Design an enzyme around this catalytic site. Structure first.
Site, PDB file in Angstrom:
ATOM      1  CE1 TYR A 135      -8.700   7.188  11.373  1.00 32.03           C
ATOM      2  CE2 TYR A 135      -8.193   6.672   9.089  1.00 32.03           C
ATOM      3  CZ  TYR A 135      -8.071   6.393  10.434  1.00 32.03           C
ATOM      4  OH  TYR A 135      -7.319   5.314  10.839  1.00 32.03           O
ATOM      5  CE1 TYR A 159       0.765  -0.812   4.491  1.00 29.81           C
ATOM      6  CE2 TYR A 159       0.432   1.558   4.391  1.00 29.81           C
ATOM      7  CZ  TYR A 159       0.893   0.441   5.055  1.00 29.81           C
ATOM      8  OH  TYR A 159       1.482   0.577   6.292  1.00 29.81           O
ATOM      9  CG  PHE A 207      -1.409   9.652   4.803  1.00 33.13           C
ATOM     10  CD1 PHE A 207      -2.011   9.957   3.590  1.00 33.13           C
ATOM     11  CD2 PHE A 207      -1.865   8.549   5.514  1.00 33.13           C
ATOM     12  CE1 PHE A 207      -3.015   9.161   3.081  1.00 33.13           C
ATOM     13  CE2 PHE A 207      -2.869   7.747   5.009  1.00 33.13           C
ATOM     14  CZ  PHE A 207      -3.446   8.055   3.791  1.00 33.13           C
ATOM     15  CG  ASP A 208       0.811   4.478   6.164  1.00 32.73           C
ATOM     16  OD1 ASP A 208       1.994   4.098   6.283  1.00 32.73           O
ATOM     17  OD2 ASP A 208      -0.152   3.860   6.664  1.00 32.73           O
ATOM     18  CG  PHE A 249      -5.172   4.321   0.154  1.00 31.18           C
ATOM     19  CD1 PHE A 249      -4.191   4.399   1.129  1.00 31.18           C
ATOM     20  CD2 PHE A 249      -6.465   4.700   0.469  1.00 31.18           C
ATOM     21  CE1 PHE A 249      -4.495   4.849   2.398  1.00 31.18           C
ATOM     22  CE2 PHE A 249      -6.777   5.147   1.735  1.00 31.18           C
ATOM     23  CZ  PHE A 249      -5.792   5.223   2.701  1.00 31.18           C
ATOM     24  CB  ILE A 288     -10.280   2.537   6.952  1.00 32.76           C
ATOM     25  CG1 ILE A 288      -9.458   2.416   5.671  1.00 32.76           C
ATOM     26  CG2 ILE A 288      -9.460   3.172   8.062  1.00 32.76           C
ATOM     27  CD1 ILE A 288      -9.102   3.722   5.019  1.00 32.76           C
TER      28      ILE A 288
END
Length: 107
Positions: A82, A26, A36-37, A99, A56
């Protein structure tokens, strides 16, 4: 709402099912924002299973809608992850998530 935009190659038949632990490269991306990730940084590609609401909801439904080798591109709505709450310090409230997801899994 899960939107699937797949970079083509894969098999198109090995679909993730219940009781199956799957492996995903991912990569998190903010719409009109930076990353962010990323699993590419830690390089341990996040062995997780299906059917326990670990991840999620936008990533949960998009995981089952892929196959082995495929490389999709998620567009997660704010209400499923979120957008009311916002993950503290990392995700602001009312955020739409992007993503880069490749399904190179097991089971």
């Amino acid at each position: 709402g899960v939107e699937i935009e797949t970079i083509s190659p894969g098999d198109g038949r090995t679909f993730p099912k219940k009781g199956q632990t799957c492996v995903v490269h991912y990569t998190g991306m903010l719409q009109n924002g930076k990353k962010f990730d990323s699993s590419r940084d830690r390089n341990k590609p996040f062995k997780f299973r299906i059917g326990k609401q670990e991840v999620i909801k936008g990533f949960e439904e998009g995981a089952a809608q892929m196959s082995l080798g495929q490389r999709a591109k998620l567009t997660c709505t704010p209400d499923v992850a979120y957008g009311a709450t916002g993950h503290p310090g990392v995700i602001p409230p009312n955020a739409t998530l992007i993503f880069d997801v490749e399904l190179l899994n097991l089971e």
